[PDB]
Design an enzyme around this catalytic site. Sequence first.
Site, PDB file in Angstrom:
ATOM      1  N   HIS A   1       0.810  -1.231   0.000  1.00  0.00           N
ATOM      2  CA  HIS A   1       0.000   0.000   0.000  1.00  0.00           C
ATOM      3  C   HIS A   1       0.841   1.278   0.000  1.00  0.00           C
ATOM      4  O   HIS A   1       2.016   1.252   0.399  1.00  0.00           O
ATOM      5  CB  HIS A   1      -1.021  -0.065   1.132  1.00  0.00           C
ATOM      6  CG  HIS A   1      -2.210  -0.903   0.772  1.00  0.00           C
ATOM      7  ND1 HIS A   1      -3.367  -0.348   0.266  1.00  0.00           N
ATOM      8  CD2 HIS A   1      -2.395  -2.244   0.752  1.00  0.00           C
ATOM      9  CE1 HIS A   1      -4.230  -1.309  -0.013  1.00  0.00           C
ATOM     10  NE2 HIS A   1      -3.671  -2.470   0.268  1.00  0.00           N
TER      11      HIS A   1
ATOM     12  N   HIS B   1      17.576  23.595 -18.693  1.00  0.00           N
ATOM     13  CA  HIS B   1      16.995  22.324 -19.118  1.00  0.00           C
ATOM     14  C   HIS B   1      16.638  22.350 -20.611  1.00  0.00           C
ATOM     15  O   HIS B   1      16.916  21.396 -21.344  1.00  0.00           O
ATOM     16  CB  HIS B   1      15.749  22.008 -18.286  1.00  0.00           C
ATOM     17  CG  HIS B   1      16.051  21.566 -16.886  1.00  0.00           C
ATOM     18  ND1 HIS B   1      15.356  20.554 -16.259  1.00  0.00           N
ATOM     19  CD2 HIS B   1      16.982  21.990 -15.998  1.00  0.00           C
ATOM     20  CE1 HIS B   1      15.844  20.375 -15.044  1.00  0.00           C
ATOM     21  NE2 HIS B   1      16.832  21.232 -14.861  1.00  0.00           N
TER      22      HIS B   1
HETATM   23 CU   LIG Z   1      -4.255  -4.429  -0.123  1.00  0.00          CU
END
Ligand SMILES: [Cu+2]
Lengths: 312, 312
Positions: free
Chosen positions: B189, B284
């Site tokens: 999770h 950049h």
């Molecule tokens: Cu789960």
Amino acid sequence: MREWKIIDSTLREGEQFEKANFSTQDKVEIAKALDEFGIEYIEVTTPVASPQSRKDAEVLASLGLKAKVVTHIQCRLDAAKVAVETGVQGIDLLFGTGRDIPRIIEEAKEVIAYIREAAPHVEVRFSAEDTFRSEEQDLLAVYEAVAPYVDRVGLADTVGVATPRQVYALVREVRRVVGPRVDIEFHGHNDTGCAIANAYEAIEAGATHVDTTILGIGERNGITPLGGFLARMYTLQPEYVRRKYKLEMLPELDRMVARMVGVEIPFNNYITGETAFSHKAGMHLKAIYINPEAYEPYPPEVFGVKRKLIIA
Amino acid sequence: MREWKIIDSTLREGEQFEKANFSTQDKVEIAKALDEFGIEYIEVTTPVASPQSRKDAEVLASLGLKAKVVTHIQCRLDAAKVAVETGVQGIDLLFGTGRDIPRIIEEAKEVIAYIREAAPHVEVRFSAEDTFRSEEQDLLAVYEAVAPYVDRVGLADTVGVATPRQVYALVREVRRVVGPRVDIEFHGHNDTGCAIANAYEAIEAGATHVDTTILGIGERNGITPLGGFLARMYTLQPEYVRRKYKLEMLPELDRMVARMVGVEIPFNNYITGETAFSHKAGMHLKAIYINPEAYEPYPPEVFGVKRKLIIA
Ligand SMILES: [Cu+2]
Ligand SMILES: [Cu+2]
């Protein structure tokens, strides 16, 4: 401890977000809310960028915040002059991304020396760009030689590809070479989903400062986000984190920035996302009734939000 | 190698997302797109949940996909009977979260034995819930004793708090105890922003299977997301990852799911987010002209998206 501080870069890294267009008043609002939250440093765009950026740096540094205001510049004499003249409390040098090492060390020491001379009380940090992809012997040689002259060295995962064990390992090596008296800063991009994990590993390896932005806004998909970082650190040091910051202010910080840059808070955003505390599975709901702690990493109330139970 | 497979759980973990309400046809659409993408396993909600969930499992498992279809159940005799009757190619057991160890081992072996008897060709995985917070001696004792009877063992960071070095360490210990012939699955999770980092560490420690969902949807803020996981693995094994999956399908997978569950793709979402390949800083942009590789972790074209240059 595991002692560390946050350098918020919402007004530097921050400004490089695709949809960021901060007025002076937007920045002052952000900076005052961060200061109230308890953030230790607020980093701002180089004053060399535009005359605008200079003005904003001048205002921000003179706001009388408790947080130190610091500006980020290329490691150059010319930029350093502009920087010191702004009154910032810190200057974050970036040596941009082979030419020989004594020379790199030379050029760095020159800028740092100028700053000590012209502004002895300003805090100086030195980073080499793309730190984790630089060849390591030469990187450590540069950091070792520059560290005695600076307050802090930084490492930057510029393209967002460092891996957590790589970050842990290189921070440990840097700590070995610079000694215990020089602080160590971590800046990490989130391209590979490791910005929070890497900031955490950096701290476990001895880093003392972590760059964050509100909602992680920045170049590309951004950097370590404040809220996700605080969720990660809260689970490990809850006493320390709740005493350091006004955690219940997080939703208002995320809202403020989302509104300013024209995005929605993502639906899975740490803590403040629509879905962050939603439970659905029956066996989860069964448990949350006896104890919400059963399926919650931290209490939603700590961060000024509420859980949701989906009972269909 | 670093060989591994993905278990997509969009139709299991998946369904526990707050706003998920998948019709049978939604699931069939998802499963066929995943199969076309090249996903190795598709995990589906327990058939015991409703008669509905059973039907969906029955259909999904008989779709004739190249992917194996697997269902997730409590580690119980009654649920196992329902599960085998559905025709799934795999059953993922979860032993839910002290009572003695020989008894836990007893009860587990009983369910597993039933399944081998009633459906010798069905692949069986065993996980204990909340694996990283279980006391470790007893956890390893259970896994060691059950592993000879199963095809795979899993570890689940159920509440999203495991740390990357913790995941690395416990996967290594599990690999030690179960030997080289039993597969190892990671489910994590994202509550503390470590789901992708942890899946990566799990693989470096010897894990062979990683659970993902499209956009990371799931309980609370969800689990390791497919796109973020693939970005992370692509930077490390680009040949392997591009040969395994139809990477240019990622935007359509993320769109499909976002549309079905009623969310916007978050603005910083890996690869397919509005902002994932936006560049703004002048230094950049200077570099991207000579070489976009300079500030890009991977090529946007590989994943069927385009970069953005902000020149103001
Ligand atoms: Cu789960
Ligand atoms: Cu950056």
